[PDB]
Design a protein around this ligand. Sequence first.
Ligand SMILES: Cc1cnccc1NC(=O)c1cccn(C[C@@H]2CCNC2)c1=O
Lengths: 155, 39
Amino acid sequence: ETTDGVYRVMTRRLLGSTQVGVGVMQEGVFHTMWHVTKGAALRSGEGRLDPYWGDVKQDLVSYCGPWKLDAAWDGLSEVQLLAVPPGERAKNIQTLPGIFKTKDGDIGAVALDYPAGTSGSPILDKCGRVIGLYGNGVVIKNGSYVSAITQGKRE
Amino acid sequence: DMYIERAGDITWEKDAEVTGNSPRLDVALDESGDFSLVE
Ligand SMILES: Cc1cnccc1NC(=O)c1cccn(C[C@@H]2CCNC2)c1=O
């Protein structure tokens, strides 16, 4: 299966079938977070997806081709997290992102909390374009989770 | 062994559940890709 869209990343290694993450298929390339697969090969029906590009520091990985997602948060408008939670249906949640101020620049951030197996779920602009992936972030002073809007570079 | 299963289309949906705040946080990113809070 190589149709565009959001996918669940699953494993049969632990008890039953467990969802370890989510990813985006776009232009024949599968995009997910590095911590979801650890760079391992993926199965799609009877087919096989091999890793193509990855970076532990960016926490991103692409399969079958180079990173295709290049849309960026405009720094002003609300966005949607297309959350794909484990054992639950794909659900769109709208929010206005905060900011992660780093020594290397500002990055958009979404203040939404979901099970760990939700890592890799895409964040979208008003035209449906993927501006980044959910699942890499921090826990703030109140116990709540805040994720970066993690985007790769299209070469 | 890992596998993928399709979960839906990527579309913007009008009238979606609006939630979550917008915090401005000072963060650091280490060589291992882990974010942390700087205070
Ligand atoms: C995604 C999520 C959503 N909602 C709540 C919690 C989480 N996640 C974590 O608390 C978490 C704990 C350990 C490790 N990683 C991944 C590493 C972070 C850098 N890459 C590896 C996590 O995301």
